[PDB]
Amino acid sequence: HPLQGKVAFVQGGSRGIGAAIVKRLASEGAAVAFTYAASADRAEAVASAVTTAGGKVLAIKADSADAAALQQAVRQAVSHFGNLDILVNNAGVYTLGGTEELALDDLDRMLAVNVRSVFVASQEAARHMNDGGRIIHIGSTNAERVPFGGAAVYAMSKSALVGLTKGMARDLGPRSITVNNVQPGPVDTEMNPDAGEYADQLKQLMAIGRYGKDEEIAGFVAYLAGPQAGYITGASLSIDGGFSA
Amino acid sequence: HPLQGKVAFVQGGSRGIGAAIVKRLASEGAAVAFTYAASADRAEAVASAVTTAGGKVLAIKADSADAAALQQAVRQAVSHFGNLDILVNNAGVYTLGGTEELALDDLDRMLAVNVRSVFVASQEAARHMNDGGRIIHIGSTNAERVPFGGAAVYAMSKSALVGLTKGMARDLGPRSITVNNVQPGPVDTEMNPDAGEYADQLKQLMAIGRYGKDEEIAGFVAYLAGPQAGYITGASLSIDGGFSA
Amino acid sequence: HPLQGKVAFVQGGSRGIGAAIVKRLASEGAAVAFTYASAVTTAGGKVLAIKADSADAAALQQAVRQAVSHFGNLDILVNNAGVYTLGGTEELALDDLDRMLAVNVRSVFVASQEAARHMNDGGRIIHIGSTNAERVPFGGAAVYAMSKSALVGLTKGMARDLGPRSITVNNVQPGPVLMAIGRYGKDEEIAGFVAYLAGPQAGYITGASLSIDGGFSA
Amino acid sequence: HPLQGKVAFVQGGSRGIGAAIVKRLASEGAAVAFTYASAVTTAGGKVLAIKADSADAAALQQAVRQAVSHFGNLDILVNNAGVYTLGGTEELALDDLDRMLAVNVRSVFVASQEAARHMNDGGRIIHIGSTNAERVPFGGAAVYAMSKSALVGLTKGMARDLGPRSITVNNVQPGPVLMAIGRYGKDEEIAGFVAYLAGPQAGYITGASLSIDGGFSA
Numbered sequence: 009h010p011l012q013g014k015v016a017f018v019q020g021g022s023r024g025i026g027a028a029i030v031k032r033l034a035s036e037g038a039a040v041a042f043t044y045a046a047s048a049d050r051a052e053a054v055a056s057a058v059t060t061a062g063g064k065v066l067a068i069k070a071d072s073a074d075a076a077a078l079q080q081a082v083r084q085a086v087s088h089f090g091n092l093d094i095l096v097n098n099a100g101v102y103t104l105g106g107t108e109e110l111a112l113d114d115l116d117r118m119l120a121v122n123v124r125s126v127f128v129a130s131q132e133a134a135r136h137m138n139d140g141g142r143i144i145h146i147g148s149t150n151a152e153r154v155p156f157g158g159a160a161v162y163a164m165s166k167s168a169l170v171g172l173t174k175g176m177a178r179d180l181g182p183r184s185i186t187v188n189n190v191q192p193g194p195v196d197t198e199m200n201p202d203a204g205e206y207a208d209q210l211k212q213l214m215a216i217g218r219y220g221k222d223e224e225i226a227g228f229v230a231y232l233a234g235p236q237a238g239y240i241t242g243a244s245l246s247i248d249g250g251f252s253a
Numbered sequence: 254h255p256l257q258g259k260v261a262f263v264q265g266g267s268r269g270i271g272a273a274i275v276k277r278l279a280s281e282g283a284a285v286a287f288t289y290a291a292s293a294d295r296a297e298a299v300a301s302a303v304t305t306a307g308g309k310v311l312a313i314k315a316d317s318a319d320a321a322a323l324q325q326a327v328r329q330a331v332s333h334f335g336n337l338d339i340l341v342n343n344a345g346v347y348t349l350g351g352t353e354e355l356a357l358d359d360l361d362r363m364l365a366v367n368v369r370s371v372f373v374a375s376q377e378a379a380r381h382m383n384d385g386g387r388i389i390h391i392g393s394t395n396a397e398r399v400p401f402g403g404a405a406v407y408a409m410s411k412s413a414l415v416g417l418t419k420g421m422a423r424d425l426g427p428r429s430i431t432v433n434n435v436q437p438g439p440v441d442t443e444m445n446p447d448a449g450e451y452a453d454q455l456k457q458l459m460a461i462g463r464y465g466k467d468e469e470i471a472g473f474v475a476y477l478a479g480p481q482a483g484y485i486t487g488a489s490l491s492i493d494g495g496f497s498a
Numbered sequence: 499h500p501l502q503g504k505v506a507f508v509q510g511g512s513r514g515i516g517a518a519i520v521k522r523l524a525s526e527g528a529a530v531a532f533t534y535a536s537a538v539t540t541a542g543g544k545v546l547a548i549k550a551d552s553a554d555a556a557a558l559q560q561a562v563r564q565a566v567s568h569f570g571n572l573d574i575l576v577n578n579a580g581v582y583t584l585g586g587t588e589e590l591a592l593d594d595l596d597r598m599l600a601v602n603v604r605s606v607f608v609a610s611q612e613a614a615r616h617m618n619d620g621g622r623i624i625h626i627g628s629t630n631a632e633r634v635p636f637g638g639a640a641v642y643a644m645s646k647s648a649l650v651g652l653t654k655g656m657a658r659d660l661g662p663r664s665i666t667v668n669n670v671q672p673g674p675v676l677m678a679i680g681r682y683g684k685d686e687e688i689a690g691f692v693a694y695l696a697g698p699q700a701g702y703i704t705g706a707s708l709s710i711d712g713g714f715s716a
Numbered sequence: 717h718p719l720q721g722k723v724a725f726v727q728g729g730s731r732g733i734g735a736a737i738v739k740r741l742a743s744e745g746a747a748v749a750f751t752y753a754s755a756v757t758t759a760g761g762k763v764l765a766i767k768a769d770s771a772d773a774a775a776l777q778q779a780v781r782q783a784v785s786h787f788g789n790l791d792i793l794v795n796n797a798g799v800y801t802l803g804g805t806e807e808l809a810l811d812d813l814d815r816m817l818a819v820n821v822r823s824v825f826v827a828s829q830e831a832a833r834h835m836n837d838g839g840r841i842i843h844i845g846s847t848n849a850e851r852v853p854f855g856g857a858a859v860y861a862m863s864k865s866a867l868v869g870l871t872k873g874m875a876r877d878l879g880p881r882s883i884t885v886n887n888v889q890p891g892p893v894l895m896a897i898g899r900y901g902k903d904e905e906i907a908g909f910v911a912y913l914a915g916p917q918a919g920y921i922t923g924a925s926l927s928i929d930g931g932f933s934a
Contacts, residue, residue: 555810586877587825587828587829587832587873587874587877587878588829588832588833588877590825590829592773592826595822595825596822599817599821599822603817603821603862603866604813604814604817607805607808607813607858607859607862608810610805611805611806611808614805614806615806630869630873631868631869633872634869634872634873634875634876635876636876637873637876637877638873638876638877639873639876640825640869640870640872640873640874640876640877641825641870641873642869642873643869643870643872643873644821644825644866644867644869644870644873645866645869646869647865647866647867647868647869647870648821648862648863648865648866648869649862649865650849650865650868651848651849651852651858651860651861651862651863651864651865651866652858652859652861652862652865654851654852654858654861655805655848655852655855655856655857655858655859655860655861655862656805656858657852658852658853658854658855658856658857658858659804659805659806659855659856659858660805
């Protein structure tokens, strides 16, 4: 239980990758607060998974487009569990549109979920974080490799995380808080499933030939959140099957 | 006159780097439309510099925080000069604040000038651009090297350009339009002058030991805008005195 | 014991980071052969120490094959040999150039090739690079940094070659063992990252250059 | 003639990109010596062609010094020698490994060192790398990519060493001469980028790896 006694906050913990992160951090001993945007039933089920197995959980409904909500959610977590040790930012909107076609609203949307709320959650978490803590952003391999049209704003929003990570690492390093950007490739989720033609075409660009699993992302995040990873900071860390080789 | 007959649009052309870009592109033969946010007198003087020397110019007052304004400015340029060949995005806000201290408004501000309006100007320019055109974003070496605290959101906003550039290059490549991100280091301007203690400390991190000059940035932008640079696309191109080595 | 039943080869496993890597892999249940014709081992033990130098391609090849004779095909190779010699561009001796190329670059490929000839599908190759591949703040490091940035291309291309066999290939980039965290790293932290990548949870990480540098390169 | 009065050395200047580089630099007014004990030149001319191979460090050193005897200290060195041999990790012959290391890596440092010994302040060193240092989409390229990603660290560190002399050091990364633009590049486009970096407007560009690849690496 490498995270016994620790308190983690997961922005977007109710489904896919975020649910697996919640469950792995709890399995390792952390008490976990997480936000969900949509489904109370889904969040209830993730919470139960933490509890049936002996872990402590708080689910918080919050819209990641609303900065006030995110700040309120962090404060509510800290009232529930005490100061944070770990923040994982996993809100994320993957929408395609060409440069000449994308609507001004889908843009301003990926900006608010994928960039602005990552900063806002990080700032409020840092204000309530123990020294020796961990902040992990979930970016994308499209920060490094954009093989097709339609991903310009999505890739912009994820490469934003590279400079955020570097500069936050400098800010928070004197507190011994690490800041890292985990860059996944394709991962099998219910809205991006490993199925169909587009999945086959993506697999052809990967050295591994398969989609990643939610639990593999969660295993990397849990390593970075743990006691062996205090020297890892400022980094953009690819876990992408070789997509970006 | 490698740009004879060409039409360029410069977002932020009235001062510093943007004024030097305007003057160099006009000197090479382009007709230049440029936006300015603040000073009609400054913009009038840049316009005169283009004209006294025999070039064609249009100055447009526009707030780079206002997407409608930027779209209107591009349309007004195209009515004045015809379809664009070149877009240079040089709006830019360099504000420092630690992660735990930066105000929600300074953040949402660097986001609007340094990220969102670069996309918005690019989209509207692309809709009115000839094939074989050029789009040049002005990013920063802080996308690659963040040596001190206080630059997290600034560096986020500039590393955003890396993925924008890659994805826009894919979108616009079939039109033979190149898309590049010029990443300057410190440059001697009236608001960031090569003078004082902070300038000396920055120079110590540079291999060159001096600030860059506005005309050196303009020379690189003019090369990238020209007829010898049609193979350069998707790139993030450092011109930083070795800051980021 | 996440590495129970697995077989590892560590090039440069006799002190510092290399010794911490050998210790950690063995503690997780791997058989470990390492370099640092002579060998030492313990009866009933699963750690084999081989003295052979990282300069001669036939020797290094032979050491790999010795390990396979003891233990079977490899699952894990870690390339951790490394020579660090400072010199300005105008002054560096050609013999120092040649030593850094032979140890830091050529021996990495030689060991990787031999390992790949005798490796189970689902294996792991981990190169030990440096954060100097990304940030070179001072003079004197040009050829050292060159030798370490070489591993970035090697990793990418080796990941493409070996991916059809489900073998991952990554480049771990340490910093000192400029800093954002205010201390140097510990050998055991570098070993814990290599052990993670060597294990069963890390099959989707490939082709990557992964920095563990205290924020040196930020 | 932005290079009037300047002296350039081009390692590998006899065909393709190298020949386009020699032509462009000379057209801008430079004296140009290039490699491709024998030499040819024209009476009254400022282009000197030297046959010496990019393998032997004393020879390459000698060619540089020959150029300095004709023309004076250098202002510009362009390293454009290059060997491209495909082979998977498991199969590549060690002699092909060794040839790519000697030509693509070691000869780049040897020429750079000799040039730096005989170079005016305010000079320029330009290495010709490859976009394969950043994107390796297919198998077969591991050692080629390794040899070319080596130049990234070299460039960074050489920029730090030579910056006090105002000498810039950059790495030009071509693509084919995956694509975003839908054609391969022309030799003369690579030469125009090298000429820009070699000129008087480019003194603030240093340490950089600068891609000219049609968007291959995007």
